Design a protein around this ligand. Structure first.
Ligand SMILES: O=C1CNCC2=C1[C@@H](c1ccccc1F)c1c[nH]nc1N2
Length: 251
């Protein structure tokens, strides 16, 4: 038995973002006056893209995922032309926005974010869910500034760009790219052309600015190993001395 929702159940507020298949609006559940986000997806568009099978899968997964660092999907409903997703609202915005505003994050903020991401990823893996698109734009912030994964090129691991087969280790690579981008302000393999970025990733060619410390370099270099089996386990990330020295939050 489940709860049935309807459009008339919410007071539509301001638009929060624009999607390639619809828009997201801030909203309030009329009964509880609870603030949430309402993502509207157009079927006609979801159809003309062959991503419907992807949405159905993601919605199934998200509904079952319950973690403080994963954006919550409370439910959904639809009509003749639209699919509505009832999502948790992250009042502090995207990590992407904070990064652009600050240009780069200090070690404390970065290690904290990496810890929250590692926890969320560890939870996902325990549920056989892998390959989360954790780019800054897909990372939101809760009322206390806690990170929330909301993924529902510069970040693809060597195995993927090379058309090879992969596993959960792709998420460890992602974590290394994010740790670097958080500390530096830009992803490690950024280049002028797609072709150049590709060769940069394939060869794991990147440099560290002078302000990136020894501990951060050790963690990033280990996460960004070309060979997936040489990348640390998520528990090793959470126990890394750079993480335990800088994270403002425990695992
Ligand atoms: O789209 C946006 C735009 N940035 C603010 C924001 C959202 C939205 C959202 C982000 C990523 C994926 C799905 C999704 F609905 C959102 C949901 N809760 N808080 C949000 N803030």
């Amino acid at each position: 038995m489940k709860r049935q929702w309807a459009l008339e159940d919410f007071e539509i507020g301001r638009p929060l973002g624009k999607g390639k298949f619809g828009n997201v609006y801030l909203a309030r559940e009329k009964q509880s006056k609870f603030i949430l986000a309402l993502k509207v997806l157009f079927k006609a568009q979801l159809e003309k893209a062959g991503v419907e099978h992807q949405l159905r899968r993601e919605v199934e997964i998200q509904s079952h995922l319950r973690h403080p660092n994963i954006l919550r999907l409370y439910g959904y409903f639809h009509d003749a032309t639209r699919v509505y997703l009832i999502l948790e609202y992250a009042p502090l915005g995207t990590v992407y926005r904070e990064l652009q505003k600050l240009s780069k994050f200090d070690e404390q903020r970065t290690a904290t974010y990496i810890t929250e991401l590692a926890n969320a990823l560890s939870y996902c893996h325990s549920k056989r869910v892998i390959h989360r698109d954790i780019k800054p734009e897909n990372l939101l912030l809760g009322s206390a500034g806690e990170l929330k994964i909301a993924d529902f090129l510069d970040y693809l691991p060597p195995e993927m760009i090379e058309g090879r087969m992969h596993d959960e280790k792709v998420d460890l690579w992602s974590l290394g790219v994010l740790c670097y981008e958080f500390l530096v302000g830009k992803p490690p393999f950024e280049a002028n052309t797609y072709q150049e970025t590709y060769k940069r990733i394939s060869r794991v060619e990147f440099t560290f600015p002078d302000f990136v410390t020894e501990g951060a370099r050790d963690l990033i270099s280990r996460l960004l190993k070309h060979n997936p089996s040489q990348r640390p386990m998520l528990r090793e990330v959470l126990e890394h001395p750079w993480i335990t020295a800088n994270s403002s939050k425990p695992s």
